[PDB]
From a paper:
The C-terminal high intrinsic disorder region (C-IDR) is partially conserved and packaged in the lumen of the virion, supported by the helical ssRNA scaffold.
Two subunits of each interacting ring contribute to stabilization, one through the residues of the α5-helix from the core and the other through N-IDR residues, including the α1-helix.
Residue numbers in the entry:
A (entry chain Ak), C (entry chain Aa), E (entry chain Ae): 55 to 222
B (entry chain Ab), D (entry chain Af): 53 to 222
Write the structure that this text describes.
């Protein structure tokens, strides 16, 4: 029974047959590109940094939000390590301009965060602090141990169960 | 014997027509909005979006797939997105929700049959569990054509699917 | 010990021996005839319909209240199908003039509703939506799956147990 | 859906009356003669026997008890007897059988309810198995109120009794 | 191997794909409509009754042929009950004009007879006399206990077995 209004479908099954959006582009668990660009272009201006080294700053922020979380203290600072030295940045632009929530704005790093949490597991065991605080004892699930992970149809069932365990 | 209803000695029912009055459950159900409430909504979104009488079908395709993976109770102040090839086309949700009487779920229940059909073909290429089942621990994959908020449980629905919806709900 | 006031019974056992009212005529689970007539004659006037086609409208309303219930939204509409077309009627006269409650006013259709919920089971399985929403999985009890059923001494024990299951 | 009978687009049945038309099985059954066939018989025997409109009831009492212990298919040329105290009053069977349409058994089926009642009271003093069960090896005594040729098996008849009649018959 | 005469099929598979007659319209277990109309219009004339009350007479006849059968004595009478009174009608027009057989002419009442043999089972047990004489001891099969039932693909296997038991 196709929907209809006035003797005409209100759908196109030609288009639909070939309309297949990925879940992480239609899903609301992740901010839209227009929202990501607004956040990125606002953090870039609020940090007095150009495109030359802004990507480098984003490497630290992602690695911070894997070890700390995506619900920080707005009146605080996120830390980056320039070798043995410490680099401190404000979290006002990070949280203020991250619409709707910083997790949705950080969900765009779910694939890279997954790579970096396994790319640092090679060689030596490594486990984010969103799993060490939430009682996770299995290193095989360290990949999925960060707040801004995107649960999709490709997520392992075991991974999709750690999250509900860690989230409670 | 049966006591047929009577007002002043006259049956208040027509039995010649009751025997031949078998409405499909969906047409008189209250989980679906009336076609007079769909037409008002449909036309309203055409007015708000300025989309012509053509091309609306393709906007309804984005909303249907969007309402499978997101839900039928979004924020009235947000924007739902549909993929124009590789880009992202954002539309406002105000006409969708403001003109959805009684609710968007009942307005979107008109797409239930197509919704399950869409999932199957999507699932006929690679696994596709709609987000409404991923955020609700729906683990069996066969019952992935019923993992959307605007599904109408009818007399033809598999009993499992019915039990599953009792699980996703709360 | 017969009741008495002043050395005379306050009962007539002659009459009583042969006073046997059916339960659905004395019971309060069903509106009185004077109340049914008032509701019927008010819905008839509020719908601008005569006796010629009012019975036909009542066929749809009963079939609606088997699939929806007897506690609807007063500021709403009940649907009837004139073939493939939809016929919409207000629920103001239905609920406003149904004293004490629309269920008591619709309890007069318990026998016919029972017939129509089994008369549509012949040929193809059919189950009201007051059982499909209230988790009923037995088709043999589809007859008794509507809000305005009249529980009498003739109700099967199994039927009288589905209702307490569906009612909670 | 049900296909109600129709001649030229009009149902050939009245449904307002079918719902309220529950005939007792005996009234339209064919194991019992019509009351228009009983009245003709009854009156005929009054004419043949010259018995008045009074005293016929007492002659029908002898025939009923006689037809329990003998059968409802006697010889048209015989005489059935009723006991007037201690003596024996013989009546001719010609009016009984000649005017029994379609048959005497169907004419005598009007006495079935009384017939079983008569046996019970008779059995409530000393054993009384009607000869129709003695010459047919009917051994259980409780089912002795159904051991007469003109009994009408209805929806209220005990299933045993029904099986027993299948045994007495042949 | 499609049938053919002279290099052309003698069938149309276009039509056939969508030619689906119900079994009770093609089957010979039931008289044709032209035969039913002839019988109905002959019984109507032979009974000195108009369309006003002919349907009422047909209610009694169906209920008679459920309790007696469809092979009666042509030189006889079928009984109807006008309350406590008896109404006698001839069986000459019923049987004389019922081509090919009265059962085929009464097969048109199979659906209604099924309804009325269950519509009288509600409330109190009821069993036709075509089952009480043919040794049937199961009330669940009382619906199918009449001579002019139409055995179709939708008949329950248990029902389709009572008939061969009752028919022998």
């Amino acid at each position: 029974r196709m929907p209809k209004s006035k003797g005409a479908t209100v759908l196109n099954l030609e288009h639909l047959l070939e309309y297949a959006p990925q879940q992480i582009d239609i899903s609301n668990t992740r901010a839209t590109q227009s929202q990501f660009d607004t956040w990125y272009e606002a953090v870039q201006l609020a940090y007095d940094i150009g495109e030359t080294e802004m990507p480098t700053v984003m490497n630290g922020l992602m690695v911070w939000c894997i070890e700390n979380g995506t619900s920080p203290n707005i009146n605080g600072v996120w830390v980056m390590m320039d070798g043995d030295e410490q680099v401190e940045y404000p979290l006002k632009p990070i949280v203020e301009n991250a619409k709707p929530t910083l997790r949705q704005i950080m969900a765009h790093f779910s694939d890279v965060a997954e790579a970096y949490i396994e790319m640092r597991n090679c060689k030596e065991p490594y486990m984010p602090r969103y799993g060490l605080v939430r009682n996770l004892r299995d290193g095989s699930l360290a990949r999925y141990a960060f707040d801004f992970y995107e649960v999709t149809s490709r997520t392992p069932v075991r991974a999709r169960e750690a999250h509900i365990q860690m989230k409670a």
